Each structure stands twice: as C-alpha cells, then as structure tokens.
Amino acid sequence: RPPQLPRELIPRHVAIVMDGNGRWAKQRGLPRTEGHKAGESSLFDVIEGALELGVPYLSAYAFSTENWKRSPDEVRFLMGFNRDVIRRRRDELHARGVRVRWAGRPGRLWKSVIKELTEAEELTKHNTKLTLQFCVNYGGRAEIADAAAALARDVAAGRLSPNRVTEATLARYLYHPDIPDVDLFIRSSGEQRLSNFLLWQSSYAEFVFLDTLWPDFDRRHFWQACEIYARR
Amino acid sequence: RPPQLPRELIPRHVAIVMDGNGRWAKQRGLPRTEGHKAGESSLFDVIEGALELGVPYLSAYAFSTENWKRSPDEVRFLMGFNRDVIRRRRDELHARGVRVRWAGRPGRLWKSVIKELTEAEELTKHNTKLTLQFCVNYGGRAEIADAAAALARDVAAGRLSPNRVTEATLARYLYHPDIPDVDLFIRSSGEQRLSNFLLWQSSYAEFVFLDTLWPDFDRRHFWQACEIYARRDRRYGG
C-alpha cells in the first residue's frame, strides 16, 4: 500500500542509480550476471511503485559511458541483457501507460540494442502515465557536450546568435528537454556520489542514500525515499 | 596535528558549501549576519588545514547567484562582507602561498566586490602551495552556459568547427580549466544537495555530509572529511 503524502510533496522526477548488482551476487555466492537479472525485477517493481504514488518521471541509470572500462565479458552481457529486458517488457510498458525515452549516445552499442531502444520509444511515445528515462550508454558530461555541439551547429548555420547563449538556450539541446529537473536522486547503495548521472538536471536535487543493494530494492524502498523527500 | 594518510588517499581538490551560519547565530540569540562573520574564521582555519595536509586545490561556495531563501538585507550584507573578507585577508593568503582564483560572473555583483577579487588574484598569481577557487556570484549551470557561449563565439568567428565538440572541447571553456575535477565535496550542514556548485567538476566527486554548522567547522572537521574520503571506494564506472 503506497504512503498517503500531499501532492505538493510528491517528487515530480525521481532518478535512481541502480548499483550493487555485482556486490549483491558476491554476498550470495552467485555469479555477477544473476545480480543484474535480479535488478530487472527491482526496476519493474519501482516502476509499479511510481505508477501507484503518481510520480510522473522516473530516470534509471541502466548503462554508463564509464561501464566500457569493465571487462569485455561483462560489457557483452550488459548489452545483451538491457536489450532482452526491453524486448521482454515492452508489451507490459506499453499496456501500463509507460513512455520509454532512451537517453544516451548510439556510440559503440550493438545495432540490436539501439534498434530495441528506438522501437520501444516509438511504441510507447503516446503514453502519459509515467515517463521512464532509460539511460543506456549515458553520461551527464556527454549529454552537456552533445547539447553544446548541437547549439554550436545552430550558431554556425545562423539559427542562433552566440551573444544569446544562456542556461535556458543550452537546456533546449539536452536529450529530452521536455523532461523536468530531478527533484529526488536516489543512490540505492551506500556509495555517496552522482557518478555522472543527469548532471545538469540534478543541480538542485535532494540526495537520498539507502544501504539497499539494487536487487533488494523494490517499491517500498522507493516509497521510503519519497517519504524522506516529503519531510525536507 | 594533521592525520597521517598516504599521498594516494589525500584529495587533490576539495569543494566546500559553507551553510548553517544563520542557524548558528539563532542558537546564540545573535543576528544571522554575525554567524557569517564567525564563518570567516572557519574558512581561514580550513585553509590552514588544507595547507598542513597538502591539499593543492580548495573551492569555497562564498556567494551563489541564487539566494532565494535569503532576505534582501542578508544578501546586501553578504556582498559587502565577501568583499571585506578578501580585502582584509589577501596579505595573509599571499604570505601563506595561497593563489586566489575568482570563479563566477561580473553580472549584478558590485564593482567594489569585483575589484577586491581581481586585486587578490593579481597579488597571489605566482603562489603554488594552495589554489583557493573563491566562488562569488557563481552557479554550476551558469559556468557551463558561459562555457557553451564562449565555444559558440569561437564557432561564429570560424576559429573552431561546430562538428567536433566533445567533453574535452567544452571543458577548455570552463572558468579555470587548469583546476582539476573535485575529488571530495563537503556539505558542512545536514542539507543533502549540490546546490548548483561545480556541477561539471563534481561528476565523480565523493560527497561527505557532516552535521557541523559552518561557524563550528575548523581544520579538524576538514581533516575528518578527508579521512572519510581516504576510506571511500572510487570506481569512476570501472
């Protein structure tokens, strides 16, 4: 049962770093891969939690620009896995009124990962109950640099004056400019850091650090974080 | 006495948000302005703490462009006060080998505040023991927007191609590109937020939220935060 909070104190936009999948599997003598598999159900449970509480925006850090520093085998697994999650869940997401918005760069992602993400976006683009910003091959600095590059192209083409480049001008060139600022930034684990996640958007966000590893995270932990947010 | 940490575990760059000045003065039945006055000595004690431990970069959020909680009178006082602090302390900073770097916008900030900041920069520009990034009329978003604007001007003048803009390109247009990433981000009080401070630079920073009101903050609290940092597991996505 979701907590009874006044509408004013419910976060419009919650961002979740889904960390500790590896560490969780080690503590249980399971392979790292099984932590990520367990993490899938955490995400769909948190999506249900957001739908029930009426949080209109959820951003999930699925795959960082910095995850390319992990082993070849773990990258191969994380690519295949994020693809298979989106394929297996897209019907449910469409049915529950979730609009999937892929944030990140195509970069060195497999074509099959880009295809699934692009199709999930197209399928769900008319949904309005919850916007899921699914961040795959995403970095906050990369997003800002891509915003400055796109702004630079408009300046070169003479669509924009360089003397009117302001914070509102740059904000228009973010991956999803219609998605508002992060109100609440949840770090599942004890790690107290942004890790390059929605950097521009999190400037004024409340940070809530829980000790729950992501595979043990569910709608109750999400509801707790929203309760902490409301009492602030 | 500063704690005995290996060089590898000493933060290269510490950033501090100096909050709780008001609440501290209220607990002692003094006006909020007097807590800011008391906060001055906290900052110089933390600067001594950084010098002793050998932290080469310190950034202090002295004055945010956005002061939305603050009364007009407290904002008027904090402008005059950040000016008077820098004027009164610049010789001591010069003597201790602290290089002052002003981060922020000229904007609505009084000419007298800009003058004192600019003179402190000129006086201390050859120092190398500690770089103090004194952030006055500063915002993280404002700095990134000013970087994009300066990049835009180079593109309009044809000094730069628009088609090859990367993270490293944009980073060259930050206020002080020679100052490295924040390793450790200290929020003095219990308030858990960045408050729009060194946003680009803090991407992979360790956050330490202490409960100390800023006027009670001194080198020992700074040393404690550095000790907490030395125990942190930094991964940068690896």
Side-chain angles (χ1 to χ4, degrees), chain A residues 2-163 165-230 232, chain B residues 2-3 5-68 70-110 112-114 116-190 192-232 234-238:
Chain A
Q4 183 71 5
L5 299 168
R7 212 174 91 206
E8 294 98 29
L9 304 191
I10 298 172
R12 184 169 50 170
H13 185 181
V14 177
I16 306 181
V17 182
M18 306 186 297
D19 65 314
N21 298 294
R23 184 149 72 255
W24 175 95
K26 224 186 100 159
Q27 287 184 357
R28 281 148 238 248
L30 297 180
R32 290 188 58 96
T33 55
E34 302 300 91
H36 289 123
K37 281 168 174 82
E40 174 185 347
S41 51
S42 305
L43 175 51
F44 285 86
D45 207 77
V46 169
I47 284 163
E48 252 303 315
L51 281 165
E52 288 175 9
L53 184 59
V55 170
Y57 300 88
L58 179 70
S59 298
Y61 206 2
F63 187 100
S64 174
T65 283
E66 285 78 46
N67 292 160
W68 292 103
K69 292 173 187 163
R70 295 199 195 185
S71 79
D73 226 70
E74 158 97 316
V75 172
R76 191 198 43 74
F77 169 80
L78 282 177
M79 297 265 231
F81 174 71
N82 281 290
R83 180 188 62 203
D84 293 348
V85 166
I86 287 303
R87 174 194 318 130
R88 276 194 314 261
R89 292 288 191 161
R90 59 186 177 197
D91 284 358
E92 176 185 346
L93 286 165
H94 192 173
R96 291 198 201 282
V98 179
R99 184 170 173 185
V100 180
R101 315 280 304 288
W102 164 43
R105 287 177 172 164
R108 293 144 291 132
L109 287 182
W110 299 347
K111 275 159 52 54
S112 64
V113 176
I114 295 155
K115 186 180 159 176
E116 288 296 330
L117 285 171
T118 299
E119 287 172 343
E121 284 186 307
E122 272 306 308
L123 183 65
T124 62
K125 76 174 168 187
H126 299 113
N127 286 344
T128 62
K129 295 198 191 194
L130 172 74
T131 291
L132 179 67
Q133 192 172 215
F134 198 66
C135 301
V136 177
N137 202 32
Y138 177 89
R141 287 191 178 177
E143 187 182 16
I144 293 165
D146 292 353
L151 186 150
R153 286 172 334 238
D154 280 358
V155 165
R159 265 174 276 155
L160 185 64
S161 167
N163 294 111
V165 175
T166 62
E167 299 100 302
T169 316
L170 189 59
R172 289 205 297 270
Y173 294 89
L174 293 172
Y175 293 146
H176 305 295
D178 51 315
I179 302 177
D181 290 343
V182 175
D183 296 300
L184 169 57
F185 188 113
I186 306 172
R187 189 89 187 206
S188 62
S189 79
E191 296 315 334
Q192 296 182 28
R193 31 181 204 248
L194 272 133
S195 299
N196 197 24
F197 186 49
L198 297 176
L199 210 49
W200 179 274
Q201 302 92 332
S202 292
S203 205
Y204 305 103
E206 290 290 336
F207 287 96
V208 175
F209 306 97
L210 288 68
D211 286 319
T212 318
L213 304 180
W214 178 249
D216 303 330
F217 205 103
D218 57 53
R219 70 187 79 189
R220 293 167 312 146
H221 295 91
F222 171 83
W223 287 337
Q224 186 188 348
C226 295
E227 278 178 293
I228 296 164
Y229 170 84
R232 223 96 130 165
Chain B
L5 298 169
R7 277 270 142 89
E8 294 99 28
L9 303 191
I10 300 173
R12 183 174 51 176
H13 184 184
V14 175
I16 308 177
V17 185
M18 306 182 289
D19 57 324
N21 295 295
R23 184 151 309 284
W24 179 95
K26 280 202 97 285
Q27 288 182 352
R28 285 154 180 83
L30 299 179
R32 295 188 52 96
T33 54
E34 303 299 89
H36 292 298
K37 283 166 172 174
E40 176 184 344
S41 49
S42 303
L43 176 49
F44 284 86
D45 205 79
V46 166
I47 285 162
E48 251 304 315
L51 280 164
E52 288 177 10
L53 184 56
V55 169
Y57 299 89
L58 183 68
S59 298
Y61 205 2
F63 194 67
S64 178
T65 294
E66 285 152 306
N67 289 292
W68 62 103
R70 310 205 94 109
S71 75
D73 170 277
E74 173 187 33
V75 176
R76 194 207 20 88
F77 164 85
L78 281 175
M79 224 157 307
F81 170 73
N82 280 291
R83 176 191 64 210
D84 296 342
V85 166
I86 225 62
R87 177 183 67 209
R88 275 190 287 95
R89 291 286 193 162
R90 61 177 188 192
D91 290 324
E92 180 194 336
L93 287 164
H94 187 17
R96 293 193 203 282
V98 178
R99 185 169 173 190
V100 176
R101 313 278 300 279
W102 164 44
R105 283 176 170 170
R108 304 267 157 182
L109 207 66
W110 306 340
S112 63
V113 179
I114 293 158
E116 294 312 324
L117 289 167
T118 299
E119 287 179 4
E121 286 185 312
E122 270 303 308
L123 183 63
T124 62
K125 76 175 158 185
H126 309 295
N127 286 345
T128 61
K129 264 177 59 57
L130 174 72
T131 293
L132 179 67
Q133 193 171 212
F134 200 69
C135 304
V136 174
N137 200 33
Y138 176 90
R141 285 191 177 181
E143 184 183 14
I144 294 167
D146 290 353
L151 190 150
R153 286 182 235 108
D154 279 0
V155 168
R159 291 186 285 266
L160 181 66
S161 170
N163 297 308
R164 318 290 162 167
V165 173
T166 63
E167 293 183 31
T169 317
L170 189 59
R172 290 203 300 267
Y173 295 88
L174 294 171
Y175 293 146
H176 302 299
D178 52 310
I179 301 178
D181 293 338
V182 175
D183 295 299
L184 168 57
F185 191 114
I186 307 170
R187 188 91 189 206
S188 63
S189 80
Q192 296 196 158
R193 30 174 64 208
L194 196 81
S195 298
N196 193 28
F197 183 51
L198 296 176
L199 203 46
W200 178 273
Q201 302 92 332
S202 293
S203 194
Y204 273 109
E206 292 296 329
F207 287 73
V208 173
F209 303 96
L210 298 182
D211 287 317
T212 316
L213 306 183
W214 176 250
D216 299 330
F217 206 103
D218 57 53
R219 70 188 76 192
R220 292 168 308 150
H221 296 88
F222 171 82
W223 288 337
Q224 185 194 339
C226 296
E227 279 178 296
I228 296 165
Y229 169 82
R231 293 194 264 92
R232 293 286 180 84
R234 309 195 75 191
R235 283 180 262 277
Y236 314 100

